[PDB]
Amino acid sequence: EMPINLTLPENIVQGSASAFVTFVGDVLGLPLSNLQNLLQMPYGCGEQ
Amino acid sequence: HHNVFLRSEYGDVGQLNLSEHNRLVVQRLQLPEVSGNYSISINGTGCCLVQSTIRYNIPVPKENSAFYVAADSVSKNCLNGVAYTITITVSVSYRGLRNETNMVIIDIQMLSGYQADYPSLRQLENSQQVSKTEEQDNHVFLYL
Ligand SMILES: *[C@@H]1O[C@H](CO)[C@@H](O)[C@H](O)[C@H]1NC(C)=O
Ligand SMILES: *[C@@H]1O[C@H](CO)[C@@H](O)[C@H](O)[C@H]1NC(C)=O
Ligand SMILES: *[C@@H]1O[C@H](CO)[C@@H](O)[C@H](O)[C@H]1NC(C)=O
Ligand SMILES: *[C@@H]1O[C@H](CO)[C@@H](O)[C@H](O)[C@H]1NC(C)=O
């Protein structure tokens, strides 16, 4: 029965705030539909 | 078997069920109040993951010592306010205690209604300072 420990930082831009909760039926289920986009950081190299 | 449910001090937000069918699809929840006091619970037998994320924007927190960057720009054809052509120049330096730095990525967001100069980007490329350029979704990425 755990609460959610959320605290928006001070000096925050008004209107830009969203609280999301993600649930998965399997432990390794989240990295399935986002395989092309595991990370928002851009690509461009061989290791990337 | 899993049944999960979220509560606030005013009511129950969500009541979801996880079973053999509901195993590979992700469940999305969005809190209507961003500063509330919520509590989740999962009941049943098995193993599950819970993720809680907060998304916001901050106004360029350049107040502490960090990987030093100083960005500015100049105009050349300034006319009646808005200038048709802009010239962006940035300065980068490293101030950490590490031995030596690795490859770095610089991202510049376009100033609202503008677009990249492809000849300028390719001139930067053929000059030997940036090994890769990229432009997409009004962000220009240079890989140093
Ligand atoms: C989590 O709880 C701590 C109290 O131990 C609090 O200082 C913090 O602001 C809360 N939120 C985050 C995101 O750490
Ligand atoms: C179990 O999940 C199914 C999915 O449709 C649905 O009947 C309901 O959400 C759950 N049933 C329960 C908790 O009895
Ligand atoms: C929210 O609920 C928590 C539960 O422990 C408690 O701090 C209090 O009842 C509420 N806090 C508020 C309304 O700031
Ligand atoms: C870090 O490692 C480098 C070797 O690459 C060498 O200069 C020294 O052993 C270390 N310290 C500094 C300040 O570079």
Q: Give the dihedral of Cα atoms B34, B37, B39, B40; nearest 10 deg.
A: 0
Method by which the coordinates were obtained: cryo-EM
Query: Distances from the Cα of B130 to the Cαs of A48, B89, B134, B137, B139, in angstroms?
Result: 17, 14, 11, 20, 16
Residues ≥6 apart with Cβ < 8 Å to B43:
B2, B3, B4
Q: What are B136's two structure tokens?
A: 């997409």
- A38–B contact, CB cutoff 8 A: no
CB neighbours of residue B40 within 10 Å:
19
Structural contact between residues B130 and B142, judged by C-beta atoms closer than 8 angstroms: yes
Interface test with A, best of B3, B6, B19, B40 (most A CBs within 10 A): B40
Contacts of A26 in chain B (CB under 8 A): 23-24
CB neighbours of residue A19 within 10 Å:
21
Q: What are B86's two structure tokens?
A: 């802009």
Atom 9 of ligand 1, residue of closest alpha carbon: A7
- Alpha-carbon span B89 to B67, nearest angstrom: 17
CB contact under 8 A, B49 and A23: yes
Residues ≥6 apart with Cβ < 8 Å to B130:
B124, B142, B143, B144
Q: How far apart are the first and last CA of chain A?
A: 40
Query: Distances from the Cα of B89 to the Cαs of A43, B69, B105, B138, in angstroms?
Result: 23, 11, 16, 17
Atom 10 of ligand 2, residue of closest alpha carbon: B17
